[PDB]
Amino acid sequence: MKIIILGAGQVGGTLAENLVGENNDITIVDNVVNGHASHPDVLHEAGAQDADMLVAVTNTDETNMAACQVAFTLFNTPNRVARIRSPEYLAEKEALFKSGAIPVDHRRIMIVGGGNIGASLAKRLEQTYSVKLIERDYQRAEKLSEQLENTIVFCGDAADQELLTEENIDQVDVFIALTNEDETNIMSAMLAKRMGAKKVMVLIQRGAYVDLVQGGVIDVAISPQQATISALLT
Amino acid sequence: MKIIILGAGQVGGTLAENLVGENNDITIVDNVVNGHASHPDVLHEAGAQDADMLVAVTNTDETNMAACQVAFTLFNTPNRVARIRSPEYLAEKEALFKSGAIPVDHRRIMIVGGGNIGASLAKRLEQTYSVKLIERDYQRAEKLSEQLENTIVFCGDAADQELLTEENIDQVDVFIALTNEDETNIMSAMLAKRMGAKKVMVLIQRGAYVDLVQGGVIDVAISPQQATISALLT
Amino acid sequence: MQFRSIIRIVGLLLALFSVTMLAPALVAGVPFVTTFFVLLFCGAMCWFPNRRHKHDGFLIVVLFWTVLGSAGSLPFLPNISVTDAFFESFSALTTTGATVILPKAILFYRQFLQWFGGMGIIVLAVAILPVLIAETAKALWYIYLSLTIACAVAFWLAGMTPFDAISHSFSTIAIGGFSTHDASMGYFDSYAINLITVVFLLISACNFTLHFAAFASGGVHPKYYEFRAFIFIQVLLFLVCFLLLLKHHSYTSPYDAFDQALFQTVSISTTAGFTTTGFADWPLFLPVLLLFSSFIGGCAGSTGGGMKVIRILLLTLQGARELKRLVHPRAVYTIKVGGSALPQRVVDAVWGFFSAYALVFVVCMLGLIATGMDELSAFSAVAATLNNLGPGLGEVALHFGDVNDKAKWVLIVSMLFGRLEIFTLLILLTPTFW
């Protein structure tokens, strides 16, 4: 598995940290290859012809997009993953990316917090049963409520029992936490189980914590690595 | 002259304001056409097949670039001008834009200010004679201080006369102010003429001031409109 | 402090130095064979008791340069006194012309010592990079083969048997100024040898690191746009010799005047050390000026470990920038002479190096005069000593034997300092290092 990571920021570096090993050959480009991530020669010097995955996590969507275009057109680099922060681009994700124009490859339910991937999975499971979206924020929850349909939108604080116990915690089949507070989520999940919640799904944004969650009373852990590394490792 | 302006922000709107008249048909797209500036239908609805110029001044370079690509590929829209704020893209402007990959079309000298177009005119005139770059700022200067060559850099305060009179203002052929907030520039130039400066070049951001500069003692005015509108209106 | 690892590696180093000690024995040399055996015995004793290994560095470089005269003086106790024997050993051993005054095999070995000195200094110089894998051996071998073969064939062309040509070639590998006769070139002057040798002198001592790309297939040689300043100095040297010749109307014939005069000026100037004139047809100032010329020495990435074009160039050109500072302190100065924007980090150490160097210069002049030496002959001697050409021409008493043997040790350390970076020894003496 030959991996090129464009941009060694927090995301690129942390990724690189999680992928070093025997079956993985990691190259990182940042201005190791010192140069501009979307320049044909910089990309060539990182061995884009032979590589099996390209991950673009630079400062800019336009550089990520340019890198994936340049890599594809010049070296036919398979599996091109790119970070795109702009909702404007995603609004046309079908026509722009999924057409290969820009060659980028990549009874009661209750979720607490909003995750983009979580929204996707929540969109995969809200067809079968109604989903209680609970969100901390007020503006985001309201905007989200107008924006999306087929889901039930609530608000409330999660660090106090007067909302989750209020909401008949025995009458709900799962508690899913999308909050990005790392572990708080873990002891708050232990506590969540303590109040009588049936199933606690926890946001855990590291795949190096596997040894830390391994001897846990927490009945399911969830890493964004196991998916976002898999689209390349598919 | 059929003009489409993508994005009606400060720049798009002000442009639209300057330009309304008999020989100009202005259409502005913003999310008048309500939609995403780089969507094929939004662009079609603004009449990109027939138009004579684009101007892409949205929030994002990647949308500006996408708009120019989509417009060119689908409607062959001539004269495509785009705002690109990212130095990373301009660093490869030759290979990216000037190749049509991304179809975007667009004795002592003394300058005070580091204008980009004035870096260009300044780059056109520093070959013949040495140019005194004077800049107010320090952080913009300490990077620049060995970044560019064939020019002599300095620092100093514009209002501070002890700097312009210091260096024998009679021994210098021009005074070129690239500073923003033009009124000051207008008065300082007058002050500059009072000190004995030979020629005063003044940054004056809006073209629409021609009636305001017309009865002036200031011996040359400089508008960014007369050029940046001419690449389209020629 | 992990003494086993140091002991085994150091023992191996002495044994390795000793292996290259069979050179006289080819010419039917018992003490040199003995030195190989004794050091090999040293390596063997260190090697067998200890099996461990380590993996401070400055200690290793000092130690590496410490071995070169641990086995260079044994066969001399040539019947001459022990201090003189040590001094003479270093004289032969270093690339210096420290004449105070032989067997055919020993003489061959002495020239061979020049060969050994000639290649060791360059490899160490390129090698300094980790503190500031052996694949460079083949490329250096090709370039070296080219240099030696060219010199030998060049001598062979001027009507001589290959043995004599090879002998002269060995003598000129690292140029002490020695020859078959202490007269550097007067004893034998065929015009072809003189012209060819002068060409050799110019090409050989200025820059080979730049041409290391010559080992690669690509031809990157047209590199005309170190060169401009250097040619200006040498051309100026030619013009001044031309002016001096015209003023004193010495020789009417062009060949003798130009070749001999040019040869003397270039040879004394280029730090080659080949001197056959006593500068009478020249004024007295010319020996003094030439001595100052001798102070300049080495080009970057070259055998000469002296002051260089880049350092002095930096001081004068950067100094020019400093002159500009004198005009206005409120003026930012950033200037790049050639390839790229130079950092202000490395540049202070160049003249801080020069300042410390001057301090060392004061130490050498004061110490050498102070130890009981004469004011003038020693004065010329210290200038010559730092450069490493030979003994002082001014008020000549070049051969000193009756000079203080402890001062002779000081002379050994001083000339070694001239070849080596002087500081390497200095770090050990500094308090708080311990």
Record keyword descriptors for this entry:
part of a larger assembly; 3 chains; A: about 230 residues; alpha/beta; Rossmann fold; six-stranded parallel beta sheet; 12 helices; about 35% helix; elongated; C: about 425 residues; mainly alpha; 16 helices; metal-binding (chains A, B)
How would you describe this protein?
Chains A, B: Its main location: membrane. Chains A, B: GO terms for molecular function: metal ion binding; nucleotide binding; potassium ion transmembrane transporter activity. The structure is cut from a larger assembly and holds two copies of chain A (234 residues) and one copy of chain C (434 residues). Chain A is an alpha/beta fold and 234 residues long. Chain A has a domain at 2-97: Rossmann fold (3-Layer(aba) Sandwich). Helix content of chain A is 37%, strand content 18%. Chain A is built from twelve helices and eleven strands. Chain A has helices spanning 10-19, 40-45, 61-75, 87-91, 93-96, 116-125, 139-147, 161-164, 184-194, 210-213, 225-228, 230-233, and strands at residues 2-6, 25-30, 33-34, 53-56, 80-82, 109-112, 131-135, 152-155, 175-177, 200-203, 221-222. Chain A has a six-stranded parallel sheet, sandwiched between helices. A five-stranded parallel sheet of chain A has the order 3-2-1-4-5, with helices on both faces. The radius of gyration of chain A is 20 Å and the shape is elongated. Chain A starts with a strand and ends with a helix. Chain C is mainly alpha-helical and 434 residues long. Chain C has one domain (1-434). Chain C is 59% helix and 0% strand. In chain C, helix 4 packs parallel to helix 15 (405-419), helix 9 packs across helix 10 (254-269) and helix 11 (285-295) packs parallel to helix 14 (375-387). The longest helix of chain C is centred in the C-terminal third of the chain and has 27 residues, at 344-370. The radius of gyration of chain C is 23 Å and the shape is globular. In chain C, 24% of the residues are buried. Chains in contact: A-B, B-C.
